[PDB]
């Protein structure tokens, strides 16, 4: 049954890895071990379909643009992660989205906007501005905490649903 290529993107330190490790291994990585490029497989059942999630966990800042280009080419859907106490990471979503659209030569690419670290008090990106961005892109917005696991499954499952809808549209 269907495989889904998910790529988790976002700035340094936003919690891409912590989110992915909560999904796969059900614990919170308290440490900060910066990523080069990690990948994970997981079988799940989403809306009664068995899915093989093929997950790419990308680096916060890449050494080569061709390395960004490549994961953007292979990925079927993108988890666009920012941290709610990191304004720059929120602003980087624009720049991710532009690079993804350019690389794929398309205006309609499955994505979900994720505001991570919702357990913190340090909030410099308000919910309304995130929801506005998402509404503008025409994609879902999900608030998450990898610390507590709030929203983690919903984030990844929504992205799968987004890919399914995109496939069903692209046939029509
Ligand atoms: N309070 C809180 N801390 C978090 C959350 N998610 C990640 N962190 C913390 O933020 C730091 C960086 O997390 P990490 O998952 O490594 O971020 P990343 O986006 O994968 N970093 P890189 O881009 O270098 O791979 C770690 O200290 C981690 O524990 C969260 O939801 N809440
Ligand atoms: Mg990481
Ligand atoms: Mg990055």
Residue numbers in the entry: 1 to 172
From the study:
When the crystal packings of KRAS169Q61H and KRAS188G12D mutant proteins are compared, the switch regions are more solvent-accessible and less sterically hindered for the Q61H crystal.
The RAS family of oncogenic proteins is important as therapy targets because of the frequency of activating mutations in almost all major cancers. All family members function by signal transduction to the nucleus of cells via interaction with effectors (such as RAF, RALGDS, and PI3K) that catalyze phosphorylation of downstream proteins. When KRAS is bound to GDP, the protein is in the inactive state and becomes activated by nucleotide exchange from GDP to GTP. Mutant RAS proteins remain in the active state and hydrolyze GTP at a much slower rate than wild-type (WT) RAS.
